[PDB]
Write a protein that binds this DNA or RNA. Sequence first.
RNA 1: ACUCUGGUUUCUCUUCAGAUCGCAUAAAUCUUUCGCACUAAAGAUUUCCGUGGAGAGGAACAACUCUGAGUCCAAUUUUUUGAGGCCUUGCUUUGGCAAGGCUA
Lengths: 74, 852, 86, 79, 272, 77
Amino acid sequence: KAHPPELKKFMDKKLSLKLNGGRHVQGILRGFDPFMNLVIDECVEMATSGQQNNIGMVVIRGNSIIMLEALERV
Amino acid sequence: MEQTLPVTVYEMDFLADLMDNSELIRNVTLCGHLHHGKTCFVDCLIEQTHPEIRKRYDQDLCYTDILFTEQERGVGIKSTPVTVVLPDTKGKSYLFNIMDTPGHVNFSDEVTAGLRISDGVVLFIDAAEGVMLNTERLIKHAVQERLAVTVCINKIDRLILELKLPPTDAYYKLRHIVDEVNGLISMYSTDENLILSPLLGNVCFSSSQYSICFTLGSFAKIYADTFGDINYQEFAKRLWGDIYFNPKTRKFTKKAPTSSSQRSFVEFILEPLYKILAQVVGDVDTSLPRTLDELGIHLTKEELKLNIRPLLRLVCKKFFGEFTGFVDMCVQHIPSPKVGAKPKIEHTYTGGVDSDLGEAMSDCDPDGPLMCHTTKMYSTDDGVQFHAFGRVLSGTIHAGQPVKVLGENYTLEDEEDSQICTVGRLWISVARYHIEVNRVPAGNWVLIEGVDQPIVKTATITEPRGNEEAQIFRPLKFNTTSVIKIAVEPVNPSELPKMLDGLRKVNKSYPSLTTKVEESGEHVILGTGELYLDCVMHDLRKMYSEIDIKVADPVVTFCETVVETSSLKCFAETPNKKNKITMIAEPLEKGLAEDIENEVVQITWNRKKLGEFFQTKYDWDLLAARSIWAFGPDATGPNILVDDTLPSEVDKALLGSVKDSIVQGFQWGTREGPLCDELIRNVKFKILDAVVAQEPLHRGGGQIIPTARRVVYSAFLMATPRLMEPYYFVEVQAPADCVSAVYTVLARRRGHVTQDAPIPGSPLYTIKAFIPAIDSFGFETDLRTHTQGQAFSLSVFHHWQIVPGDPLDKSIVIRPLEPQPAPHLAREFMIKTRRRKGLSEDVSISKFFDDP
Amino acid sequence: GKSSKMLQHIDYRMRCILQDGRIFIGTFKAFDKHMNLILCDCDEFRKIKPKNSKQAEREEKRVLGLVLLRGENLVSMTVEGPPPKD
Amino acid sequence: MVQPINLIFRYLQNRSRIQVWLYEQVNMRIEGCIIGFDEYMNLVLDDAEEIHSKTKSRKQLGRIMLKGDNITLLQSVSN
Amino acid sequence: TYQRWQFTLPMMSTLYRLANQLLTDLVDDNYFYLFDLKAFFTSKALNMAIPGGPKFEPLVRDINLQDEDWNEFNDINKIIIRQPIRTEYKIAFPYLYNNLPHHVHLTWYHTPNVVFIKTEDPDLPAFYFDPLINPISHREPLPDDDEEFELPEFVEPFLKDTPLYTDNTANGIALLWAPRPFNLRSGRTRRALDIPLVKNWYREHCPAGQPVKVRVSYQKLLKYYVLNALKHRPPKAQKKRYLFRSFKATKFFQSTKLDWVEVGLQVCRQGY
Amino acid sequence: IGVPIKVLHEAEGHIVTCETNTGEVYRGKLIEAEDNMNCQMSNITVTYRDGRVAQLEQVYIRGSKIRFLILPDMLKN
RNA sequence: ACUCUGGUUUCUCUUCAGAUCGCAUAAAUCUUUCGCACUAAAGAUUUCCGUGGAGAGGAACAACUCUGAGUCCAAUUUUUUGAGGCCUUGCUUUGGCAAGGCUA
């Protein structure tokens, strides 16, 4: 038990993620954890106005994870 | 549907719904050597799927051997495909289009039929006997067939209880088996990704005799159920191999610690199995309850009072539960029909994958044109009607639909072989009790009923009034070639029409069976071996044509062959003297015949690729290799037609106007042969020159082809010819104490023991030989009789060798009942063939020549 | 000790109103400890539950098939009747 | 394979000023230098300040304890 | 009533050890190829003779060789002869090497060889690589240990306490391959006369170098067995009336117990 | 083993839809139906609550924001 | 682990059994078969040699061993809450309903 999420196929691939509060980010998955904490290397968050701000590698928790969409071939 | 089916764990509606899905159907064939355990493994699968059907304590419930010949003879006769829904390791339920092919080397035709209606092959290897001749042949054929492969190891109970090797030695034997399988794979594979290993998840360890199927993932999941909170995938990734486990660090170390830690697999997989099998089979009465409590299984007083073997089977079935590991491995390796649609279309489907119809077929969309394909044609219980069997590459075949069943030669230019029929009342692919259905989605295996009228060997059912630009799926290419011939005639000639109707039916039934009537009126039917033809007769005289038929003595289909070069230039002229062709014969360079016959040198390629492959590999002149005309008798034929006409004397365009006729004549001649009316192999007929008239009325047409055949026969006769006979490789597996008797038996059949070697881990050696097929009739009975029933052997036509003597030798007498000596074989063979075929008893070098 | 409260409504047509406000009426053929329900022949209606509606009884009714209602958004459930033979 | 826990531990050991977004509330987040983290996602942020993107105001609170449920995403910042 | 005989594994092992002299000590039934009941039935039905087996009168009268006159499919001047097809090669493949094989029972193909290394010394362990078994030549992308593949402290093999060998383990594994009464562990007490202790000897191939009288006796015994087997009409459904129990119910009979010698002497006097 | 997790694991290989708590409905082939409600599809059509529909070559929604899932009930009978 | 119809042995009778009724094997009659039938085959029939299934009755000692049955989870991913409030539009069953935009 205590298996991690499906981050092996999406690891090292540029894809988008939806975070809570209406947040949208795009980056490469550098790894995942068992509590849904994933590492987004070279992450860029798209604001509601249209502009995107690059925040670099960040840690995303699994509670506010809405859905991930692979932007490349998996 | 208002049908009737035996009780099953799944639901018939659920099965139909799963079939409607396009990416969850497993099209697999359980290829495996003779008596490896394939049929018993399918029986275990059925027993899990069908609760009512259970195996008897002594006689195994062979639910995949429907035919009586397979029921009593013991060896599997034909493939009984089963389509059943079984769960997986994770829990998702798939459906499997299994096809339990037989293991006999003679019955390789059914295996070849199965692969064209499947996406992957599950090779079966017996643990005790390792790889065998049939196993290696099936591996080579499957890899050449471009299908996924998943080797599984069965009969582990033999190692655990009969052979009694220690667990470390058991792992050593298993690793050697896997290494040999991988090495054999790499000999013919193309992509390096085609690797097999328990670490890669493409290996299963089963025991059909006791239902002990498992794998790394499944058995790690068994630990997970027993312990909990264990990462089954990652842990199983460390459960196999040379790495040893270190209890002190609670981690698996690549370098073996403590100097006494066995491999991970032996430590965790083999040990428990050994312990449980030893407790069940050796100490049941004393320590049966404690071991059962430790393992968790509970058995009632009645269940624990069984015999040792059924009790062991029950305990193993309780311990391992369902065969989840096999399904998981098949899902992992063998792709879905939609995933594998493109490889199938590229390989077997004709007309090209890049074509529009090819693209539609590759899409594998049920809402598309119907382009199904039926490999095998099964027979009804009564033996009157035939039920074609195949898998739908596209569309959805439904009962009562009108279809256009394209035959085995329904080309695009000449659709004359098409027969517009009305398929109807089709069932699902069950083993012992078929289940009806209304439609058949693209991907499932459909047993149509009504399209059997034009379906002789193989056919592709299409959609009438549409798909006008369609092709017929490529005809099957069998592993080995049939060389045995047997004339058959009814005892009472009154019932001849019944016997010939039965012969047509049995020709339809057996894929590789070849039947014909020669100029002598004999009803010759071919066949791979000896037991093959015995089964053919036991079906012909007792199932289809209930009359009694008399079968002559078996023979071997000899083939012509030229040794020396052409004696002189043969000047053959067409009727009315409008054309005068000339051809010079020459034997083909060694290896080129086997390269063409293996489809390596494919004339289908363009001029550049064929020219390069001829100038480089065959060392042919860059100008000589650029004038090839045809490929002898067949598309893949051992003869090469070369346009050796000098341009200074012969116009290229004028020769091209007769090029088609010349190629057709050369093909007909190479199919016929000048010596014994047999196929001519290992020759290179080159047209030295030719005279061609202008008008097509005078030149070509119906005059060039007979002149071409005459010139070909004259060229193949002028050059010193020699008959050839099939030599069948025999791999006798006998105890090392009896290998001397095996060598002694093969001495009296003009055959040399090519290689003797012991089986790694098994006391029985595996002697390999090459006995000519002509004198190989009954060799199995002698080998198993001179050894008091302790040796079994098989056969397969490896190659052809020249007859010891000379065919055109009029100085050698013959005898009616005395076997001709070694030097007097070729002339005797030629004379007896020309007499049996009823042709003229004399074939002189000036028979078909122009001057006589 | 018994646990028959989930088995009494199992296999019968129940109409459950979740926390989102929709009412799913279908054959409750699946259950679990986390409140995950399985509705065979389930119809979801978000306008109003039709119970003797004079103007209309089906408003915004969508058929799903094998609907899987998660237990995280479950609020309450109501039994409508027994299941059919098929 | 860089996990999120190892990256959070490296950001806590580096003492860099990182910004964390509120879970279910993107209008206001926190920013500061976290000295260490806990097992329940609660970190001890030194010189933490609440920055609201709607009003463009920053209110500093000092050494704060950020719970793992209130913070949804955390990114790197230069200041 | 003595209807069930279910003994423990060591008891059956001791019984087999005390009776291994009369047992044929076979493993695979393939050693009786073309010498089984089906083979004998096929030989008798085909008017042929297996050299090691019996021969009976033909089931169907066979016409003479001259009855046919050089038919197109029977011309000797066309058949290529390499080896003479013996009666064994015809009884083995009846459908391919015998014209008109009416009522010819087929025989089972070779079952896989039972490669069971029989024990020879109790001192050696149970699962040991015996010298008879051919040695295995010891010549895997194993993942590195740098990961965190750590197992819980409670994870252990299922039978860590259970040994891989036992005193009765080797003996128990021996009884797997044995004559049928030894193979089973629970049986019904058959009648004394219904247990032939010498049938397996006759059924096997005759011992080498036996005199002509012994070979003829073996052939006659095989003929009697084949006759009793081919005529094995299943028994009919009786009403299950016991003549002995009926006479016991009759008031004109008493019951007692006496030695077989005394009863035999009394029976001899009564017969006189 | 739950009945819903077993139906999600056995629902792989066929077409099904999954609606989240925010109204995002992704319909397609359930490539991965994990026990933690993680639904991974390939070439899934995702329609949001506003009405805009798009296609994703590989989408993966976590089980924390799962509202409902409609799969084919033919495998249940 | 709470309780519960449920003991085996043995004797007798009836009835059914084409299952290798029996991991054994005989006898007799007829029929066809060549003789000129212990030394012979085939087909059938019948009686024994003695079984299994079920039922019924009886006397010995087990009363529930047995088995079948009636009987420790608050901190992500479901059940110990991102929880409550503001405005607009159509109907107001003037309670509020459905949707959209915000503070939390």
